[PDB]
A paper describes a structure:
The N-terminal domain (Mot1NTD) recognizes TBP while the C-terminal domain (Mot1CTD) contains the catalytic Swi2/Snf2 ATPase that binds the DNA upstream from the TATA box. Swi2/Snf2 ATPases are members of the NTP-dependent helicase/translocase superfamily 2 (SF2) and are well known as the principal ATP hydrolyzing ‘engines’ of chromatin remodelers that govern processes such as transcription, replication, and DNA repair. Mot1 is an essential Swi2/Snf2 enzyme in yeast and the Mot1-TBP-NC2 regulatory axis is highly conserved in eukaryotes.
We determined the structure of this construct (residues 1–1836, Mot1∆C) harboring a point mutation in the Walker B motif (E1434Q) by Se-SAD to 3.2 Å. The construct covers the entire Mot1NTD and Mot1CTD domains but lacks 50 amino acids from the C-terminus. The CtMot1 enzyme is a ring-shaped protein. It forms a ring-like structure in which the substrate-interacting HEAT repeat ‘arch’ binds both lobes of the ATPase domain from opposing sites. Lobe 1 of the CtMot1CTD contacts the C-terminus of CtMot1NTD via HR16, a small insertion within HR12, and a ~ 45 amino acids linker. The tip of subdomain 1B interacts with HR1, thus lobe 1 effectively closes the ring structure of CtMot1. Lobe 2 binds the cleft between lobe 1 and HR1/2. Although the precise orientation of lobe 2 might be additionally determined by the bridge element that is missing in the structure, our structural data suggest that the auto-inhibited resting state of CtMot1 is stabilized by the interactions between subdomain 2A and HR1/2.
Author numbering: 2 to 78, 108 to 170, 308 to 431, 438 to 689, 728 to 1038, 1041 to 1537, 1543 to 1650, 1656 to 1761, ...
Write the structure that this text describes.
Amino acid sequence: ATRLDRLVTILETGSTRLIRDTAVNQLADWQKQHPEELFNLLSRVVPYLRHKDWETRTTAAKAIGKIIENAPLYDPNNFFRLESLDVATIVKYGRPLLRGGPVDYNLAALDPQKRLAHLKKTLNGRLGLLGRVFEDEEMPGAEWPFERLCEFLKVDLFDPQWETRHGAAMGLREVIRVHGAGAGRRRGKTRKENNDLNRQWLDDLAYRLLCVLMLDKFTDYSSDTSVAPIRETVGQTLGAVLRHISVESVHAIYRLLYCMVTQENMWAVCHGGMVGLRYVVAVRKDLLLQDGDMIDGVVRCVMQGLGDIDDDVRSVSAATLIPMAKEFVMMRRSALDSLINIVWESLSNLGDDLSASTGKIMDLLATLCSFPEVLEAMKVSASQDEERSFTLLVPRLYPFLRHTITSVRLAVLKALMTFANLGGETSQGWLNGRILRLIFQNIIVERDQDTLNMSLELWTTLVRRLAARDPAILADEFEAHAEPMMQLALHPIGVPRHPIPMNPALFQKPSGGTYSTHDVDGHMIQGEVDLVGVDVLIRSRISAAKAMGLIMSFIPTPRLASYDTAVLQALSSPYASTQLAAAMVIDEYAKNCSTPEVASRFIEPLQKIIDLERPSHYRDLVTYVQRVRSASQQLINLFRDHGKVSQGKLPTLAVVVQGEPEAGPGAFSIANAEKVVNEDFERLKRLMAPGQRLIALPQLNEAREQTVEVIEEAKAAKEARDARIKAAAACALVAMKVLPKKPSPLIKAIMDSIKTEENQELQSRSAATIARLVQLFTESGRRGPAEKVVANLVKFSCVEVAETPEFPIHAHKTNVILSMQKEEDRVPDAVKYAREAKAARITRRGAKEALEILSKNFGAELLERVPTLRTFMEEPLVRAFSGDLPPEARDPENAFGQEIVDAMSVIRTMTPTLHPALHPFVMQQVPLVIKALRSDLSVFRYMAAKCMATICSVITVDGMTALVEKVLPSINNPLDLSFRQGAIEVIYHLIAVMGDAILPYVIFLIVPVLGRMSDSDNQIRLIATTSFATLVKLVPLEAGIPDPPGLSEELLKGRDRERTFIAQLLDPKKIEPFKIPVAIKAELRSYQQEGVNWLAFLNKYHLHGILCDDMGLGKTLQTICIVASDHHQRAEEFARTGAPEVRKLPSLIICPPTLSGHWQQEIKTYAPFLTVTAYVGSPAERRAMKDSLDKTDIVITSYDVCRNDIDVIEKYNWNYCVLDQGHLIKNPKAKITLAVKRLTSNHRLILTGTPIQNNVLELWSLFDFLMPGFLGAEKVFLDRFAKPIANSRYSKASSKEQEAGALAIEALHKQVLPFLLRRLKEEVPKILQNYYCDLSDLQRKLFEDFTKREGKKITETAGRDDKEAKQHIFQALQYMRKLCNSPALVMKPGHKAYEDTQKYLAKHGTTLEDPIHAPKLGALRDLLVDCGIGVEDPLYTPIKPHRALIFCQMKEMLDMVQNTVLKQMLPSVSYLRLDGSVEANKRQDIVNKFNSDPSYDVLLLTTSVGGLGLNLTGADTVIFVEHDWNPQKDLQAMDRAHQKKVVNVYRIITRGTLEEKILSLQMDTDQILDLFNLG
C-alpha cells in the first residue's frame, strides 16, 4: 500500500519499542511539515484505539499525543450540568461496565454516524438518568477541530467492550492535555461567551468521567500492575481536565468525589473516587491549600481508605497523600497524631508475600518518617501506650524487606536506619536476633547494589548499637541464628549450566516459619549463574563475609568455638567456592579486631593453604571435567568407527570423574584426558594402515583439538580457583600482620591474583592488600622485598598495549601520528589474540589500582617512602630530554626506548590519584614532556601527548598554563613539522581525557585547531578535523560556557577573536552581516543576505557546509555572491602580501548536465564581471580548453564529463568547488564520488533539497568531501555510527542495543547540524516562476528545416489580416509550440522530412522518443529532485516536504511525462493521472485518494480536467510543462482545481523560442515575424 498506510500499520506490528516509537515520530513529523493533513493522520490512528491488544492501544494513543502537539492551539479571537449530578441514581440505576463478550451485529453494520446517533439516545438511559434500569429493547475555521472526534470518544466511554473504553479514555487524555483550553469554543463570539461555553464543555466531560468511575466494575486479576485498568486510566484522564478548568469547577468535582469515598462500602465506587482524589491533589495542590475545608475532607477520605479492608484501596489512598505529606504535617499537627497510627494500622494485617500495589503504603510511611516532627509524636505515643510501642510497630515493616519493587526494599532499610539512630530507651524491643537474621538474609539474596550497600550499612549499625549494650547480649541474640547463616555465607557457587541451589529451609520468614509477581529471591536462592550474573553471586558471598566478619569481632573469643569449627571445616571443603568464602571471613574478622593478635589462632590453617599443594580437583568444577570426558570418549569412539581400530587396543575411560561425591582414587581426571590426546592419539595412530589413516585423520585431528579446547578450558578454570583461595588466605594473613621470614610465597599469592583475576571485587581486595603489605615492609626495614613488589606493580601497569605502546614496534616511525593509526587499526579479530589482550587489560586494571591505593595510603609521603617510584617516573626522562636525545634511545634492541615510554605511562597512571603536595614533582617533569612532544620519533610524541593531556586535566591551573604558553604558540611554525604533529596530538588527547569538562578551556584550543585543518601535512589535517568534530559534539548548545577557574586574568583578555566564533557557531542567528564588496546586480532579500552571511562565516573560519534551502529561495544567487566576493577579497590580499594561499585560482561549479546552462545564464545576469569557461561538450571539444582552464574566474562542469576528464581537472588547483545537486556523491564507492574527492580546493559547498535519506552512510560520503576527517575514515564511521544504528533497527534487538542506536543518531545529528543551512520557504500570493532549459540538436535542426520551406510563405501571410492567412500563421505557430515541447509531437509519419530525420537519428544512433531530444523532460526531473519529491520503507526515510501538480495541454505529452519522467527516471515517485478520457465517475475516485492519502507525491493532469471544479488541498507546488496562448487560462484551471501555505508555480520554458517571447509580451506584424526566429 501507500507510505502512510504502511507507516500507521507499524503501530500494530512494531517488534521492538524503538520501531514503534520511530513510527509515532514519523506521523508527528508528517503533521509538523504538513499541518493541513491533521485529520488524515488521525483518521487512521484513532481506529487503533479499539484494538484488542494493550500495546497497540498504548502506542496509538501516544501517536495521537505527538501528532496533536504539532497542531496550532485554537484561539478564535445536549450538555451536562456538573452541579445537577446525583451519586445515588447513577450507582443504583446505571449500567455496570464489564468485560464485553457480546457483539450485536445489527448495530455493528450501521452507518458510522447512525451508529453514533443511536448510542447518544441510549446514553441517557444507561447512565441511570431515568428512575429505572434501562434495557436495550426499549430502543432497538468555524469551531473546535476535534469536536466531531470527541463525540465518538465521549460516547465510547460507556461501550460494553472494556478494550474500547480503555482506548477512548487515553485518547481523551492526550487531546485535553495539549488542547484542553480551546474545547467548546465557536467562531463568532467574544471571550466571555465561549469562556463559559468552554467551562460547560469541560464540566460536561468531567461529568462523564465521574460516571465511568462509578459504573466501571471491570477488574483484571491477572497482572499485579493495574487492578482496575479502566478506573486507573479514566482517573488519569480526569487529571488532564483539572489543569484547564476554573477553581469553582474543581471544588464541584471535589464534592462529587467525596461522596464516592465516604459513601453517605462498595469497593468499586470507593476505589474510583479515591483515584479521582489522587489526581486532584497532584494537579491542583495550590487551589487545595487555601480552602482548609478541602484539606480536611481529602484527608478524611485517605484515612478511611488507609483503614479499608481491600489492599488496592489503601494503595491509591497512600499515593494520594504523598505529594503533600510535608505540606500536611506543617499545617495540621492536631490531625498528625491520628494519621500515624492509622498508617501503622494498615501494615499490621499483612503477611510476608505482598502484592506490588501495597508498595505505595511504604512510600507514604517512608516520607513521614523522614520528618523530625513525626518522629517526636511517635515517641510520645510510645511512652504513653503499650500498643504503640516500637516492639509492635517496627516488625510490621519486615514483610517489606523482600518486596517485589526495587525502590521499596531500599526505603525500608533507610526507614529501619532512622529507628536505630533514634534512642536507646526507644529501640530495643525490636532490635534483637530476629531482625539480625532478616538483614543477613537480605545481604545474601539482594541483587541491586544500592540496596545491598544499605543492607551492609544497616547491618553495621544494628550490630554496633546492640554491641554497645553488652557483647554477651549480642552473641546471645545471634547464637540462635548463627548456625544456619554460616551455611549460607559459605554456600558454594555454581558454574553456568550447573547451579548449586541453597536449602530454602534455612530462610526464616518475617512470619517466623521457613520457606517450604512472586519468586523474588528464587533465582539467586536457586543459584542460577546464567540468569543472575556470575559476579552478583560472588559479591553476595563477599558481602556475607564482610557481615559475618563484623559480628565476630564483637563476640568474646571463648564463645566463638562453634564459628571456628565451621570455618576450619570450610578451609578443607571440596568446593573452591567455600574455601574462598572461608578465608574471606577470617580476613574481615582480623580487620575489625582492635589488635590483630586476637585472631592469631587462624595463622596455622591459613599458612597451610599457602605452603601445601592445592587439590587437583574441586566439586564446583565437576561440570568442566565431565565435559572433558565426553570429548575424550568421542575422540576414542571415532578411533573405532571412523578409523578401523580393534576394541582391544582402545583405552578405557572411567565413568565417574574426580570431584564427584563417592569417587574412588581411580576416577577420571584431567591428567587422564591429557594422556588420551598426547600419547594415546599417537599410539592409536600407529595402528592404522597408511591408506586408512589418510582418510580418517582429517576428522580425527578435528576431534582431538575440540578435546584440547575443553581440557585447557577446565585447567584454566581450576587454576583460577587455586589463585583465588591462595590470595584470599594471604590477604587474611596480611591483616594479622604476618610478615614471614621468607615472604616470597606470600607475595606470589597476592600477585597472582592481581595478574589474573576476572572479577573486580576480588581483585580490588588483593590490590588493597599488596598496598598495605608494601607499607608494612617499609615500616620495618625490609626494603628488599618492599622495592621488588612496587617494581612489579610498575611493570604490570604497562602490559596493556592499548595504553602503553611497545617501543620496538614503532621505533622506526617518524612524521607519523600514532593516534590516527591506533583507531584505523583496531577496525585483528582472532580468538587467541583477543584472549591475550584480555589478560593484559586485567593485569593493568589490578596493578593500576594497587598504585592508586598505595598513593592514598602514603599520602604526600609517597615519593619519600617509596623512592623507587620517583626513579621510574623521573630518571629516564632526564636522560633523554635534558639536552640532546642520546643515540641509545633510538635503538629498538636497547632497553632505553621502552624505559622512556614506561616512565610517561606511569605518570598518567598515578597523576589523578596523586596527593596535591606532589604536583610540584609532576610539574618538574613537564619541561621534559614538552621536549618529547617536539621529538622526531612518533612513539615519543604519542605518549607525550597522552601524558601531558592527563597532567593538564589534573593540574588544571599550571598544566593548562604550561600548554597555552609553551606548546600552543608554536603550532604555526612552518619549519618544525614534528612539533606541529605533537601539539595537535596533545590537543586531541586533551579533549578525550577531559570530555565535556574541556568546555571552559575551548577558548585556548579553538584557533590552533581551526588553523590546522588548513595545514600542508595531511595527517595533521585529519587529526585536527576529528578533534574539531569532538568539540562540536561536546558543546552545550542552549547554555553558556564558563571561564576557566583559577587561571591568570591576563590569559583570557587577548582572546576575543575566539569568543565571537563560538557564539556564532552555536546560534547561527548571531552571524555578523557581510557587505558584498562587488557590484552584483541583485536585490538581496532578508534571508538571501542572511544566507550569504552564513557562507561568509564558513569561508572566514575555513569551514564547509551544505546549503539545503528549499526550491524558490534562490540558492544559485547566494553562491555567485560568495564566490565573486571571495575572488575579489583574495585579489586584494595577494596584491598586499603575495602569499600562496590567496594566489589567483579559478573556482569550479559541478552540476548535472541539464543545469549547465542554468549556471552559465545566472552568472551572466548577476555577476557579468566574472569570466566563465563551460567545460562541457563532446570529447573533441573538451580537449582544446583541456589545457586552458585556469584562464577564467569560474569553470562549469557536468558530473559526467568530470569522470572521463578527471586526470585533467585535478591537474589544476581550485578556489571554490560547488556541487549543485551533491546527493550524487552519497555512494562512497561510486566513480563520480572518488573523482570529485581527488580535487584540491580551498572552499567547498553542496547544494541539495534533501541532505540525507534513511541511510547514514550517505551522509558520511558528503561530509567526507567537505571536511575529510570530520566523520573519520569509513571503517571508523561504520563502527561508531552505522553499526549501532543498523543493530537497533533489527526486529528482535536488545534494549541496550536500542539505546546504543538511539544515542548514535542523536550524536551524529549534533555534529553535522551547524554545517547545514536549512531554512524553510514557508514559516519565516502564489509565486510564479520560469524554469529555463536549452534546445537540443534535433530541435535546432527541425526549427531550421521549418523556416527553410514555410518561412518563404510566412512573409506573405503575416500581415495580411486575411481569412486563410491568419489560419496558416496560427497552425504554423502550433507546429512550433509543439516542437518546443518535444520533437516526437511533430515528427510523425507523413511529414515531408520523416525519411531525412530517421537518417539523422540513425547516423547518431538514437531514437525519436529518446528523452534527450525533449529537454523539458530532463528539466522536469531536476525540478522534482530539487523539491524533495523525486529521489534517484516509510519508516526510516524522511518525510517528503512537497507535493506537486503537473499540467499539460495534450494527452500525448502527459504520456511522455508519465512513461519517461515518473517511470524511467523517477520510479520511486507515487503519482496519479487525470485525463478527459478517464470516466467522470472514476476521476472522482482518484481525486479523493489524492486528498485522503498525503503520500501521493505528484498528480498528473491536463488543463482540460482542471477546469472541472474539482478541489484539491494537499497540493504545494504546481508545474506547467505545456502552455496555452492565453496565459490566464493556465491560471484559471490551476485555481479552479485547487489556502494556508504558499503555492509555487513553475513554467518550463525553452530559451530562445517563442515561449520566451510570448510570455514576455504583456499584434504588430514584424513582432509576429520575430516569433519565427531563435535567440
